[PDB]
Amino acid sequence: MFQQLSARLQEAIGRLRGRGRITEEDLKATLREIRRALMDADVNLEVTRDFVERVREEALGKQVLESLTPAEVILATVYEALKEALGGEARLPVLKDRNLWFLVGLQGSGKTTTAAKLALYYKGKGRRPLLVAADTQRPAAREQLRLLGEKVGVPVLEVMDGESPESIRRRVEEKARLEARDLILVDTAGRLQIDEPLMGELARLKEVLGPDEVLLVLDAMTGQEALSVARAFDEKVGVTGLVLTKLDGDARGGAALSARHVTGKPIYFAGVSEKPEGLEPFYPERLAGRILGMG
Ligand SMILES: Nc1nc2c(ncn2[C@@H]2O[C@H](COP(=O)(O)OP(=O)(O)O)[C@@H](O)[C@H]2O)c(=O)[nH]1
């Protein structure tokens, strides 16, 4: 992901390198090339404009028009902007004594496999996870998580068809008690498109279970519709953090890049492969460095 954008940003910066001091017109041309490139990666006009303005301001503050190496000033400011556009420092959910997190999103987003990968990740960090297959309408969706839980060595409770949220609560509580589970990961129903009633039932499930986190899983190979999925889930259910899956895929990446800005929710993890350990904590500073060719 981001290959084309990466190449283009590195080219724009490299074009300045070794040619000494630049003029204001030269700087304008470079900022244009950056803003346009972002565009061509399908970043929305606002994220592009704001990003380039940030860079212009910070570069001018660093006396880019006095520098004999403006390329390095532009590199540093694009890096620092790009790192904060993605979240700044790395964040992860606050682990307290007994946690309950929803995973929400579309079918095909990576949501169900992410639930199992999270369980594995946190089991390795000493937590005691429980997976909950919460689709009350589609047994096949629950069976998928059951198998994945088996794969990662984490117990799975399956809800029953049509089970009330109160009953789900009661059964999850019981199992968590008996098995000393301290991280409960609820894989909620996924559909290929936003399903309004589901969204109603999901909001209700949230009222009854009271999750500490609601993690929206988005496929980073998709476009701006990912952020309108994000708005729909956030308005109606209320979301606390993002997981971006399939960062290993080929795609423009503009919607993924902006997700942190459009949604105002931290990216906690990113999926980087189809393997059980393809999941890892998201580090803005690391993705920014990659995109700019710094390893
Ligand atoms: N390469 C790669 N594939 C992924 C990743 N996350 C999910 N997948 C694949 O995405 C597809 C859909 O995932 P699944 O968990 O079934 O999605 P769900 O329908 O939202 O629950 C499956 O083929 C997964 O193996 C990822 O981070 N990298």
Q: Per the annotation, does 110 bind a ligand? A: yes
114 C-alpha to ligand 1 centroid (Å):
7
Whether ligand 1 lies within 6 angstroms of the CB of 188 is answered as: no
Which atom number of ligand 1 is nearest to the Cα of residue 116?
15
Report the run of H or E that residue 102 belongs to, with start and end: strand 99-104
Query: What angle, 0 to 180 degrees and rounded to 10, lies between the N-to-C axes of helices 196-209 and 225-236?
Result: 50
278 among annotated binding-site residues: no
| SS3 of residue 168 by DSSP | helix
User: Between β-strands 213-219 and 183-187, what pairing exists: parallel, antiparallel or unpaired?
Assistant: unpaired
* Distance between CA atoms of residues 191 and 277, nearest Å: 25
Residue 222 has phi, psi (to 5 degrees) of -95, 170
Beta bridge partners of 99: 183
Specify which residues 218 forms β-bridges with.
244
Asked whether 147 lines ligand 1 (CB < 6 A), one says no
Q: Where do the H-state alpha helices sit in the chain? A: 3-14, 24-40, 45-61, 70-85, 111-124, 139-152, 165-178, 196-209, 225-236, 254-263, 284-291
Q: How far is the CA of 38 from the centre of ligand 1 (A)?
A: 26
Sheet architecture: strand order including 156-158: 156-158, 129-133, 183-187, 99-104, 213-219, 241-245, 267-271, 279-281
Looking at ligand 1, which residue's alpha carbon is closest to its atom 27? Answer: 271
**108 C-alpha to center of ligand 1: Å?**
6
**Of 42, 39, 70, 41, the residue nearest 56 (C-alpha):** 70
CB 77 within 8 A of CB 62: yes
**81 exposure class (CB count in 10 Å sphere: 0-12, 13-18, 19+):** buried
Cβ pair 281, 92 in contact under 8 A: yes
Cβ(113) – ligand 1 distance below 6 Å = yes
Q: How many CB atoms lie within 10 A of CB 233?
A: 26
Are 2-90 and 91-281 the same fold in CATH?
no
Q: Between 70-85 and 45-61, two packed helices, what is the crossing angle to 10 degrees?
A: 130
Q: Describe the crossing of helices 45-61 and 254-263 by its angle, rounded to 10 degrees.
A: 80
Amino acid at the residue 241: G
Q: Using the 8-state DSSP alphabet, how is residue 160 labeled?
A: P
Name which of 147, 141, 177 is nearest 159 in CA terms.
141
The amino acid that residue 179 corresponds to is E
Ligand 1 atom 10: residue of nearest CA: 110
Amino acid symbol at 265: K
The annotation status of 153 as a binding-site residue, yes or no, is: no
- What is the domain partition of the chain in residue ranges? 2-90, 91-281
- CA distances from residue 8 to 36, 40, 62, 71, 293 in whole angstroms, order as listed: 10, 10, 23, 14, 11
- First-to-last alpha carbon distance for the chain, in angstroms, is 15
112 annotated ligand-binding residue = yes
Element (H, E) at 183: strand 183-187
Burial grade of 63 (CB within 10 A; 0-12, 13-18, 19 or more): exposed
Residue 259's nearest CA partner among 219, 212, 211, 202 is 219
Q: Is 190 annotated as ligand-binding?
A: yes
SS3 (DSSP) at 52: helix
Q: How many CB atoms lie within 10 A of CB 287?
A: 22
Are the beta carbons of 276 and 270 closer than 8 angstroms?
A: no
Whether residue 191 is annotated as binding a ligand: the answer is yes
Distance in angstroms (rounded) separating the CA atoms of residues 64 and 73? 6
> Regarding the domain delimited by 91-281, which CATH topology (the fold level of the hierarchy) does it fall under?
Rossmann fold (3.40.50)
Burial class of 288 by CB neighbour count within 10 A (0 to 12, 13 to 18, 19+): buried
Instruction: Give the helix ranges, DSSP H, for 62-195.
Output: 70-85, 111-124, 139-152, 165-178
Tell me the fold of 2-90.
Four Helix Bundle (Hemerythrin (Met), subunit A) (1.20.120)
Contact 15, 7 (CB under 8 A): no
Rounded to whole angstroms, the maximal C-alpha distance in the chain is 70
Q: Which amino acid is at 28?
A: K
Q: How many angstroms is it from 262 CA to the middle of ligand 1?
A: 23
Q: Ligand 1: does its nearest atom lie under 6 Å from the Cβ of 245?
A: yes
Q: Is 2 left (phi over 0), alpha (psi -120 to 50) or beta?
A: left
**Cβ–Cβ under 8 Å, residues 230 and 215:** no
Q: Whose CA is nearest to atom 21 of ligand 1?
A: 112
Task: List the one residue out of 78, 67, 88, 63 whose CA is nearest residue 31.
Answer: 78
* Cβ(273) – ligand 1 distance below 6 Å: yes
10 Å CB burial of residue 5 (0-12, 13-18, 19+) is buried
Q: What resolution in angstroms does the PDB record give? A: 1.2
